[PDB]
Structure 1
Amino acid sequence: KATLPLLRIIEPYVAWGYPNNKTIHDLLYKRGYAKVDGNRVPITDNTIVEQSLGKFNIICLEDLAHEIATVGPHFKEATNFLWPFKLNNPTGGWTKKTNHFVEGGDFGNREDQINNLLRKMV
């Protein structure tokens, strides 16, 4: 209830949905960057995750994926440790970007179809 109002305020400018297992793992492995001392460092090794989230028992990319997917007690730290993902334009294009998903457009809540979009964007 503290985040949904924000998602309603920013509706016309975002496409959001419910990520699934493959989506989370693809995002983390192909485009995972950590915020280390204010620097964007690619996560090419599990030690990079361990150095910053080891205090919370998160030692591997799998631990990070589990924390995100199941919304664990350290979801805030796990997600803030990640640099905002910088995705590629989808291969196939968008649809409208100026109308809601239910109007045949792009913005708003696509529910589980964010995975369909991310399979092209990531």
Structure 2
Amino acid sequence: VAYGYPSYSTIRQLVYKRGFGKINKQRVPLSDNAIIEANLGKYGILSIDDLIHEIITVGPHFKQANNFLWPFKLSNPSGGWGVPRKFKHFIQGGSFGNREEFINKLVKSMN
């Protein structure tokens, strides 16, 4: 895996473009506030922007909110992986590991 600490811009763009909710074991594009409303309205979540809020500021209902969000299907990075060989650690010139803020650049090229 490759992971890091994501910013508001990265997370906001992900849900808007590639955010899907787990609706009765079905992968449903959000595409409306009522879809989140009828499914996450118990915890005070009423919108796609509210859902992003519970993600970035880890709230009391982050577990349910994150679980509702379907796992994101990303493509390969647009500009490439930045390295000749992926399966070395980021510290060792590779791709895997913790890239503390450079995940934003990587995910945006994927998104």
TM-score norm. by structure 2 comes to 0.95
The runs of 5 or more residues in structure 1 that have no matched partner are 1-13
2:97 pairs with 1:108 = yes
Specify the code of the residue in structure 2 equivalent to 1:58.
I
1:63 aligns with 2:50: yes
Give 1:83-102 correspondences, 5 Å limit: 83-94=70-81, 95=83, 96-102=85-91
Write the mapping of 1:1-122 to structure 2, written as runs, cut at 5 A.
14-94=1-81, 95=83, 96-122=85-111
> C-alpha distance in 1, partners of 2:86/2:48?
33
Q: Which runs of 4+ in 1 moved over 3 A?
A: none
1:97 deviates by: 1.8
Task: Supply the RMSD in Å over aligned alpha carbons.
Answer: 0.7
1:40-94 CA distance string (max 9 Å, x none): 0001011111111100010001111110000000000000001100001101222
**Which residue of the partner structure matches residue 11 of structure 1?**
none
Structure 2 spans left out of the alignment, 5+ residues: none
Q: Secondary structure at the match of 2:99?
A: strand
Letter in 2 for 1:103: Q
Q: Return the letter of the residue paired with 1:108.
A: G
* 2:92 partner letter: E
C-alpha separation in 2, matches of 1:40 and 1:97:
30
Residue aligning to 1:9: none
Give 3-state SS (helix, strand or coil) of 1:111's partner.
coil
Q: Distance in 2 between matches of 1:97 and 1:82?
A: 28
Aligned residues between the structures:
109
Who is 1:6 aligned against? Answer: none
